[PDB]
Assembly symmetry: D3
Homo-oligomer: 51 residues x 6
């Protein structure tokens, strides 16, 4: 019906909210790890150089 | 040490959000499962009272 | 004052936000009953028809 | 079981929303009750000072 | 580098909206403490006048 | 007394909000902290490469 339909379009949209905020957390996480990897990679470049 | 506390806090927060998205799917799916039983139960009724 | 009538607005908007979320939680829970109750009734009909009543 | 455990999860989240709406109404009521007796006191000061 | 910068702003937005809520709560605690102090001011005035 | 716990329940919610605002700044800080160390390291690689 109509009262039922408007409940599905909210429950679906409320879901992708939680599925969006989980992606934004994933965005922060493996962007920290990306900077972590560049840091080690640049550190080892420096080390291999002075060696 | 202090870097991998925030890192643990984020993943714990990320998982907390993931469960919410899954809790919504089980409610949105169990709804869809129940109406499917209606359409399949009401059809049984119609077929049955077509026979008499 | 006016700040005191800006905070009352913020509260009564915050409050109506909470009342609405509790209402949405009901219709989901209420509809999950009207559908579950309908299936017992629909099942009780399929039975009553096969028995020939 | 799958269906009736999520119903708990739903009811517990509903009351977790009602409890919030009650906590807000408690602030809005108690902050008006304060505002009320202040006028009720402000009048006694005026009534007393007039005689 | 660029998708990164949309995340920095999202983190900044959530930070401000958290500071806004911390300030909004402060006004709730401040107006309450302001009101009970006006009571004691008005209540003790009535008492002085009543003597 | 009924007034009392509300003021603590309200102050506690203020602390929960203050804490979240701090945690967001950490991520903003340690992010900007890492991108600074990564530029500083990148400069060392340039200077040393001669």
């Amino acid at each position: 019906g109509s009262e039922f339909m408007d409940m599905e379009k909210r429950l679906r949209a409320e879901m992708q909210k939680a599925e969006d905020k989980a992606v934004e957390h994933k965005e922060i996480l493996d962007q920290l790890e990306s900077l972590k990897l560049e840091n080690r990679h640049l550190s080892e470049m420096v080390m291999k150089l002075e060696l």
